[PDB]
Amino acid sequence: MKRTWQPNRRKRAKTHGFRARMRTPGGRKVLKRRRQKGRWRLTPA
Amino acid sequence: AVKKFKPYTPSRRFMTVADFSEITKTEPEKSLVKPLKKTGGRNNQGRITVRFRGGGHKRLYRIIDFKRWDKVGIPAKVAAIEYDPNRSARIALLHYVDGEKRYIIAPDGLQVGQQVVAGPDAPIQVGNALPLRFIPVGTVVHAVELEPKKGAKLARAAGTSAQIQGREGDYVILRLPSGELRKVHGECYATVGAVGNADHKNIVLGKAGRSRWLGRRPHVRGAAMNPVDHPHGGGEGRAPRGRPPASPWGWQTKGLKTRKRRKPSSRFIIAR
RNA sequence: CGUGGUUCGUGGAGCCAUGGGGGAAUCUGGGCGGACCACCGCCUAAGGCUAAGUACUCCGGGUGACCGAUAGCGCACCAGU
RNA sequence: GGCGAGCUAGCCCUGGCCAGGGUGAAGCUGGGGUGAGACCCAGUGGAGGCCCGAACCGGUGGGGGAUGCAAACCCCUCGGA
RNA sequence: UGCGAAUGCCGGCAUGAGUAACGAUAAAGAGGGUGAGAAUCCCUCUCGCCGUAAGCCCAAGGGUUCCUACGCAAUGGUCGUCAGCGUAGGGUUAGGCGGGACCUAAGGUGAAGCCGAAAGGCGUAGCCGAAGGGCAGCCGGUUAAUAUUCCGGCCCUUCCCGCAGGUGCGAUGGGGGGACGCUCUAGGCUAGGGGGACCGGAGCCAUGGACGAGCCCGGCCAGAAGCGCAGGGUGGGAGGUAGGCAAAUCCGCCUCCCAACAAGCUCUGCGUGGUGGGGAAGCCCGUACGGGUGACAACCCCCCGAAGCCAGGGAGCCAAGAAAAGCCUCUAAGCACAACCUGCGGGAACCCGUACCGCAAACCGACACAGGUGGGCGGGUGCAAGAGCACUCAGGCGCGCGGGAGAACCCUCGCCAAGGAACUCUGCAAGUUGGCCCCGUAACUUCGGGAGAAGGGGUGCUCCCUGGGGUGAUGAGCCCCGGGGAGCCGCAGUGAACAGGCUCUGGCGACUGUUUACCAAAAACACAGCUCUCUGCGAACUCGUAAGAGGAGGUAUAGGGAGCGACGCUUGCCCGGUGCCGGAAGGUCAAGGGGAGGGGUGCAAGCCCCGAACCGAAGCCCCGGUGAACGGCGGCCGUAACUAUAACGGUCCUAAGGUAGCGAAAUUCCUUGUCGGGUAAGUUCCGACCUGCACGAAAAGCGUAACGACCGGAGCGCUGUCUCGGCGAGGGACCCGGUGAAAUUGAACUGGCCGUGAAGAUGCGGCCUACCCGUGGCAGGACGAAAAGACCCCGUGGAGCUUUACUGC
RNA sequence: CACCUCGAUGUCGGCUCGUCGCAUCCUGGGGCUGAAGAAGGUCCCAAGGGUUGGGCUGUUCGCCCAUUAAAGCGGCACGCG
RNA sequence: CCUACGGGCAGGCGCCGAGGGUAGGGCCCGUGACUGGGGCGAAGUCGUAACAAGGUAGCUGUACCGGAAGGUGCGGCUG
RNA sequence: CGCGGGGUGGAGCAGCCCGGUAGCUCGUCGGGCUCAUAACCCGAAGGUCGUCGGUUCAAAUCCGGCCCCCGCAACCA
Ligand SMILES: [Mg+2]
Ligand SMILES: [Mg+2]
Ligand SMILES: [Mg+2]
Ligand SMILES: [Mg+2]
Ligand SMILES: [Mg+2]
Ligand SMILES: [Mg+2]
Ligand SMILES: [Mg+2]
Ligand SMILES: [Mg+2]
Ligand SMILES: [Mg+2]
Ligand SMILES: [Mg+2]
Ligand SMILES: [Mg+2]
Ligand SMILES: [Mg+2]
Ligand SMILES: [Mg+2]
Ligand SMILES: [Mg+2]
Ligand SMILES: [Mg+2]
Ligand SMILES: [Mg+2]
Ligand SMILES: [Mg+2]
Ligand SMILES: [Mg+2]
Ligand SMILES: [Mg+2]
Ligand SMILES: [Mg+2]
Ligand SMILES: [Mg+2]
Ligand SMILES: [Mg+2]
Ligand SMILES: [Mg+2]
Ligand SMILES: [Mg+2]
Ligand SMILES: [Mg+2]
Ligand SMILES: [Mg+2]
Ligand SMILES: [Mg+2]
Ligand SMILES: [Mg+2]
Ligand SMILES: [Mg+2]
Ligand SMILES: [Mg+2]
Ligand SMILES: [Mg+2]
Ligand SMILES: [Mg+2]
Ligand SMILES: [Mg+2]
Ligand SMILES: [Mg+2]
Ligand SMILES: [Mg+2]
Ligand SMILES: [Mg+2]
Ligand SMILES: [Mg+2]
Ligand SMILES: [Mg+2]
Ligand SMILES: [Mg+2]
Ligand SMILES: [Mg+2]
Ligand SMILES: [Mg+2]
Ligand SMILES: [Mg+2]
Ligand SMILES: [Mg+2]
Ligand SMILES: [Mg+2]
Ligand SMILES: [Mg+2]
Ligand SMILES: [Mg+2]
Ligand SMILES: [Mg+2]
Ligand SMILES: [Mg+2]
Ligand SMILES: [Mg+2]
Ligand SMILES: [Mg+2]
Ligand SMILES: [Mg+2]
Ligand SMILES: [Mg+2]
Ligand SMILES: [Mg+2]
Ligand SMILES: [Mg+2]
Ligand SMILES: [Mg+2]
Ligand SMILES: [Mg+2]
Ligand SMILES: [Mg+2]
Ligand SMILES: [Mg+2]
Ligand SMILES: [Mg+2]
Ligand SMILES: [Mg+2]
Ligand SMILES: [Mg+2]
Ligand SMILES: [Mg+2]
Ligand SMILES: [Mg+2]
Ligand SMILES: [Mg+2]
Ligand SMILES: [Mg+2]
Ligand SMILES: [Mg+2]
Ligand SMILES: [Mg+2]
Ligand SMILES: [Mg+2]
Ligand SMILES: [Mg+2]
Ligand SMILES: [Mg+2]
Ligand SMILES: [Mg+2]
Ligand SMILES: [Mg+2]
Ligand SMILES: [Mg+2]
Ligand SMILES: [Mg+2]
Ligand SMILES: [Mg+2]
Ligand SMILES: [Mg+2]
Ligand SMILES: [Mg+2]
Ligand SMILES: [Mg+2]
Ligand SMILES: [Mg+2]
Ligand SMILES: [Mg+2]
Ligand SMILES: [Mg+2]
Ligand SMILES: [Mg+2]
Ligand SMILES: [Mg+2]
Ligand SMILES: [Mg+2]
Ligand SMILES: [Mg+2]
Ligand SMILES: [Mg+2]
Ligand SMILES: [Mg+2]
Ligand SMILES: [Mg+2]
Ligand SMILES: [Mg+2]
Ligand SMILES: [Mg+2]
Ligand SMILES: [Mg+2]
Ligand SMILES: [Mg+2]
Ligand SMILES: [Mg+2]
Ligand SMILES: [Mg+2]
Ligand SMILES: [Mg+2]
Ligand SMILES: [Mg+2]
Ligand SMILES: [Mg+2]
Ligand SMILES: [Mg+2]
Ligand SMILES: [Mg+2]
Ligand SMILES: [Mg+2]
Ligand SMILES: [Mg+2]
Ligand SMILES: [Mg+2]
Ligand SMILES: [Mg+2]
Ligand SMILES: [Mg+2]
Ligand SMILES: [Mg+2]
Ligand SMILES: [Mg+2]
Ligand SMILES: [Mg+2]
Ligand SMILES: [Mg+2]
Ligand SMILES: [Mg+2]
Ligand SMILES: [Mg+2]
Ligand SMILES: [Mg+2]
Ligand SMILES: [Mg+2]
Ligand SMILES: [Mg+2]
Ligand SMILES: [Mg+2]
Ligand SMILES: [Mg+2]
Ligand SMILES: [Mg+2]
Ligand SMILES: [Mg+2]
Ligand SMILES: [Mg+2]
Ligand SMILES: [Mg+2]
Ligand SMILES: [Mg+2]
Ligand SMILES: [Mg+2]
Ligand SMILES: [Mg+2]
Ligand SMILES: [Mg+2]
Ligand SMILES: [Mg+2]
Ligand SMILES: [Mg+2]
Ligand SMILES: [Mg+2]
Ligand SMILES: [Mg+2]
Ligand SMILES: [Mg+2]
Ligand SMILES: [Mg+2]
Ligand SMILES: [Mg+2]
Ligand SMILES: [Mg+2]
Ligand SMILES: [Mg+2]
Ligand SMILES: [Mg+2]
Ligand SMILES: [Mg+2]
Ligand SMILES: [Mg+2]
Ligand SMILES: [Mg+2]
Ligand SMILES: [Mg+2]
Ligand SMILES: [Mg+2]
Ligand SMILES: [Mg+2]
Ligand SMILES: [Mg+2]
Ligand SMILES: [Mg+2]
Ligand SMILES: [Mg+2]
Ligand SMILES: [Mg+2]
Ligand SMILES: [Mg+2]
Ligand SMILES: [Mg+2]
Ligand SMILES: [Mg+2]
Ligand SMILES: [Mg+2]
Ligand SMILES: [Mg+2]
Ligand SMILES: [Mg+2]
Ligand SMILES: [Mg+2]
Ligand SMILES: [Mg+2]
Ligand SMILES: [Mg+2]
Ligand SMILES: [Mg+2]
Ligand SMILES: [Mg+2]
Ligand SMILES: [Mg+2]
Ligand SMILES: [Mg+2]
Ligand SMILES: [Mg+2]
Structure with missing residues (x-):
């Protein structure tokens, strides 16, 4: 039946995007985290 | 006066619809003075703060005139009486000789041809707005202000009226639809007559769906x-x-x- | 009056800070020595600056009765893959 | 302390869809009726959380499936339309 | 620092096992080719399957999967020479298509402003924000692979400059406009489709007949101006003006004068059109696809006809149906040797996307997964219609293991003698019924219903006669509704496919609806409707620390909370307790005021502590009201001229002792109460009695037509449900080739009985029986597998819930 | 009673298939009788084989209808998921 | 088959048709657990409604209430 | 079996707690008013306190056994 993943390019940027991460202070932290750890990707592609 | 239906379907049995004979040749309710986009939403920033609301026919807002001193002396002719989905009452569209058009909440018995006016002058006839103080004790009235210049806020629902039981000092005694006794400042514009479309009290939605068109979601x-x-x-x-x-x-x-309890308004009230 | 800080949890409860109310004085003036008074002493609030000794290790070096590829950092290897 | 309404629930803005059948409300016109009416009868008309029934939305009973085709499926039957 | 256990951790390898399975039962067969190797790749022919699709286009998403050469280790459930796989090279062409240098929507963001310990929150203008609004390209050809993008033909927009002609030009400002619902619907067209004796075409005469008005095949597409046909839009002139936050000559309003018509003007649609281009069968070629010919192809008449176009068309209705820009007009500063408008002409025209898959092997589901996924097109014949059903065109497929065999057993189907619910918890299941036309149809009812009630008859084909309509000329043709008559055939004419079994009677809920995504669809929720109660508007109420916001741009015929639940007849008594409402007195009580008096230290002045009376709120007490507020609504004894029984009486208690109605009930313990009814036989069912363990009136009482995939009873019809089984079919099971799992597993050389043993022994005792090893089957046992029992207890273990538990906010 | 089993010994009835016991329901053989015959009563022997179809209820059981030679009682984890 | 054949009879088919069957209605009668009132019946219970202001003038139509007669409300009659 | 309450003149109740008193209404009996009855008024009688013990100076009362009657409870399984 209908599963949980209905990919939508716009939703994914609008939600987990870089510009999205940067507004909420909690989001900046996510980035600050993924950098510290050295994530090759700070954000979904 | 409230149309009935034969029971050719259940719910159509006891169902009842408004009578629209007072609706002068009218449909598209003239833009300019209204409509106006009505932002219909059942709650505030985020959360629901009033329960069981939503859905319901989309509706254009009719920007009506709730302060008439705006046009002292300038009379106007009653051009139409039309449907407003934003109130129980019906709204009269009145052309001024100024060339300006605005809607007013239609008083009862207000015929489509009358000259209307507002001001200390103003003949005491149905449709004319006046500062309360200049209105003869005992006359019924509607669309009353509660404080001078703040715009009419009382007796605007279909059939609602208000009697002026007396005067005292700068105030006059009103008996409201609620039955409350209220001192109101004499300087507050009211408008003689009683609202209208008063058969409104006796309609019967009939079915569940009907309550929904009005945008009322189920209540548990x-x-x-x-x-x-x-x-x-x-x-x-x-x-x-x-x-x-x-x-x-x-x-x-x-x-x-x-x-x-400590409401300052208290010292101007006297009933139920 | 209401609270915090101090070992001090209302305790005889000072001292320091202060949200609220009232509200001074300028050397013979003021604060303090644990309720309060006296005596005796200590110190000069309501402005500010000040190196060094002190803390830490992304980083560099030196050592090891530290590990030796299931150990040792998650990664000795194109691993935060 | 953060991450989630790309599943699901509700609401908001803006678009889209519902084969074809049937029943025949008001109103209208004509005839009758009366003092005038009510009302009656035809014809017309085409209302309804109305009827039958695909799409579409469902999940009623049963059978199968049970390391499945499937971490909710398949067939027959059934509800709304 | 020593391992054998921790349902231990990581890793390796076993067992089950050559076992189950190899993923829809739409289906295959042969020939030829290639190759080391072929059921599996290429080609041909034959067969089968989709065809509102299993064909075709678009949007998401995916991201080289596209085309070609070479290749087969692995991925492919077998094979593989093939592939969506490995390597390499190629491939995505736009002023007009989509999106951006346009507009606004919800929402977001956000100068001003407001609020918040910090983080931050709100927020007017503005800005961002589209599948909505605006806006100029149609058709053919070409590539192995792109094309409205290249080419070809015809056509078009904007920007810049110039020339001419015209005018007060000028806007972020004003106004008109854009501009809007649902249902039904007129006329005229179009896509689309059928027919044709007419036009064009390779061929064909078979097997008994046919050389024929034979058969088979095709008879179009795009297209400016102009012109026609249909439709939408729209008044003209003058005067006054105080309104449209400046100004308008525009709009609004008033008077007057002319058309009220679409006449005029204007826009769109359709037709015709220069021109451009396509163009079947069949046959020939060689494919892995296509290509030549057929061709100088022909290219025409008739009919059926949209849900689409003219579009803002018309009518009815109530629930009363976005915005902004482009656009037009008006003026403002400003400029008017400007500027703008019309026509022509030259020049200029940017960024991103474009391959391929897209109902699926390329998207979401760990998989080449029987699931999920939005919009458009979706032909023909027939069946009353239709997107239904059957067959079929175009196109696409036979679903990536096969070959044999003909057991049990299972799944999915077909039929069955006689009987016909005897089956069972229950007709579960399955059968019967079944479309259309006509005849006919009850109680009851809210007059609509109940109704497809029930129950019936007709249904094919042939010939003859005959009526009406649409299109044409009134005529033929063609298409459509029929009407009457005489006959033919079969077991049977909706001859296949899709297509209600019916009636009677109770319970609950009025009704359509909603719900435990994945064990409950219901008598539960919701529902119109009744009642209570709150709220006078900066309303009550809700969210937030706040600003603020919803309520509502609403105003008591309104909004919030609560119960009840269409409708009908109704809804009694108790205010003592709890709640709520009213009560300016009195009683009590906090801070505070107040200070009579007491005390600590000083020689003193003083300084500093306590602290009575007294004036000090709400609340509580107290005093009343209140029942669609929380709630409640008796006990014993006696009594009538047979007997029973008790209208009547006595007494105790209470705030008051249950009224109407209903009652063995979704409630009745005793209980299969008792009587009647149904049945040969009735624990259930219906009617009734009242002895109501333990009904009762808005947690409503009693009824009620209609409605129900609810639940109970009865009958008719019909049946494999059954007596009671039998046969048959296909898919597995079996055998052969290929691939090849899983839970589980202390180790095994793993029998019966009677005993014993931690009380249920393959494993101990005694006896009995038994050569070693497999295969197809059955499930009694291994206290068989699975899950550290959900029940039960235990833990001074958790958590959700409640209140007159405690203590807080 | 609390002995094995709470790191699971599925718990009523039905259906299917049975197998055993005898304390025998029927048939076979008997003694006694208040056994005339017929039919019975009662105890003894005997487990070969047999022991019906229905209505009510989930029922086991029980009641009832119609029969019958008879409509037997128990055990087998109240036999057997 | 018979003729005195362009005939008759037999025989065949068809309409109608007694009645039989299936289905659904109507009217009437009998009967039924139980149940409503009614009539009648030498000496039952309870009360006092009416007749005399019947000890609350009576009666009345309607409505509510009550062991019972009744009471009360609203209006009407005078008998 | 469990738990709680009750038993007192003829009827229905109080008196039991807290030891010594037996009380209220009705009924019954005699007397009045009445033609008579009821109602009404004046008087009166009647109880060992469910039984058996126990405690105490003394028991309806406090205690235990039993006999009765009424009510409640019986859940997970
Ligand atoms: Mg996932
Ligand atoms: Mg993923
Ligand atoms: Mg998108
Ligand atoms: Mg920062
Ligand atoms: Mg890198
Ligand atoms: Mg509700
Ligand atoms: Mg303490
Ligand atoms: Mg201070
Ligand atoms: Mg000093
Ligand atoms: Mg000090
Ligand atoms: Mg000291
Ligand atoms: Mg000091
Ligand atoms: Mg200082
Ligand atoms: Mg200083
Ligand atoms: Mg410093
Ligand atoms: Mg270092
Ligand atoms: Mg070492
Ligand atoms: Mg290693
Ligand atoms: Mg390592
Ligand atoms: Mg490091
Ligand atoms: Mg590691
Ligand atoms: Mg690396
Ligand atoms: Mg969502
Ligand atoms: Mg419907
Ligand atoms: Mg229906
Ligand atoms: Mg339907
Ligand atoms: Mg469709
Ligand atoms: Mg199902
Ligand atoms: Mg279900
Ligand atoms: Mg199912
Ligand atoms: Mg199932
Ligand atoms: Mg159906
Ligand atoms: Mg259906
Ligand atoms: Mg080991
Ligand atoms: Mg060990
Ligand atoms: Mg390895
Ligand atoms: Mg095996
Ligand atoms: Mg096998
Ligand atoms: Mg197999
Ligand atoms: Mg496909
Ligand atoms: Mg690749
Ligand atoms: Mg190749
Ligand atoms: Mg390979
Ligand atoms: Mg392979
Ligand atoms: Mg596979
Ligand atoms: Mg390919
Ligand atoms: Mg490749
Ligand atoms: Mg495109
Ligand atoms: Mg530019
Ligand atoms: Mg914008
Ligand atoms: Mg913000
Ligand atoms: Mg924008
Ligand atoms: Mg658009
Ligand atoms: Mg465009
Ligand atoms: Mg093309
Ligand atoms: Mg292509
Ligand atoms: Mg055409
Ligand atoms: Mg055509
Ligand atoms: Mg030729
Ligand atoms: Mg021939
Ligand atoms: Mg010829
Ligand atoms: Mg043709
Ligand atoms: Mg005009
Ligand atoms: Mg054209
Ligand atoms: Mg043209
Ligand atoms: Mg040509
Ligand atoms: Mg081919
Ligand atoms: Mg219109
Ligand atoms: Mg703008
Ligand atoms: Mg101009
Ligand atoms: Mg392309
Ligand atoms: Mg393409
Ligand atoms: Mg594919
Ligand atoms: Mg495609
Ligand atoms: Mg599709
Ligand atoms: Mg996939
Ligand atoms: Mg596959
Ligand atoms: Mg698939
Ligand atoms: Mg779906
Ligand atoms: Mg036919
Ligand atoms: Mg059909
Ligand atoms: Mg189909
Ligand atoms: Mg087919
Ligand atoms: Mg084909
Ligand atoms: Mg397959
Ligand atoms: Mg049979
Ligand atoms: Mg038969
Ligand atoms: Mg039968
Ligand atoms: Mg039966
Ligand atoms: Mg049976
Ligand atoms: Mg069935
Ligand atoms: Mg069927
Ligand atoms: Mg019915
Ligand atoms: Mg035929
Ligand atoms: Mg004709
Ligand atoms: Mg049907
Ligand atoms: Mg049906
Ligand atoms: Mg219901
Ligand atoms: Mg659902
Ligand atoms: Mg469910
Ligand atoms: Mg609930
Ligand atoms: Mg507000
Ligand atoms: Mg608002
Ligand atoms: Mg309810
Ligand atoms: Mg009540
Ligand atoms: Mg009370
Ligand atoms: Mg009270
Ligand atoms: Mg009270
Ligand atoms: Mg009280
Ligand atoms: Mg007698
Ligand atoms: Mg009960
Ligand atoms: Mg009987
Ligand atoms: Mg039952
Ligand atoms: Mg009761
Ligand atoms: Mg009840
Ligand atoms: Mg509750
Ligand atoms: Mg309950
Ligand atoms: Mg109630
Ligand atoms: Mg109810
Ligand atoms: Mg009822
Ligand atoms: Mg329903
Ligand atoms: Mg149902
Ligand atoms: Mg069978
Ligand atoms: Mg063996
Ligand atoms: Mg043993
Ligand atoms: Mg031994
Ligand atoms: Mg042994
Ligand atoms: Mg074996
Ligand atoms: Mg076994
Ligand atoms: Mg088996
Ligand atoms: Mg086990
Ligand atoms: Mg455990
Ligand atoms: Mg605890
Ligand atoms: Mg919650
Ligand atoms: Mg609560
Ligand atoms: Mg034990
Ligand atoms: Mg023990
Ligand atoms: Mg175990
Ligand atoms: Mg024996
Ligand atoms: Mg039964
Ligand atoms: Mg047995
Ligand atoms: Mg037992
Ligand atoms: Mg058992
Ligand atoms: Mg089972
Ligand atoms: Mg009788
Ligand atoms: Mg009687
Ligand atoms: Mg009387
Ligand atoms: Mg009397
Ligand atoms: Mg009287
Ligand atoms: Mg009484
Ligand atoms: Mg009366
Ligand atoms: Mg009277
Ligand atoms: Mg007594
Ligand atoms: Mg007495
Ligand atoms: Mg006496
Ligand atoms: Mg004694
Ligand atoms: Mg419990």
């Missing part, structure tokens, strides 16, 4: 709930309140008075 009794979400909720095959009847938020809903 606490009783039907669990204890998590309402004071009455749980205990097997239902069971009497089991406490003094209360709102989902805990407060009692039978009799408990809720008006703030």
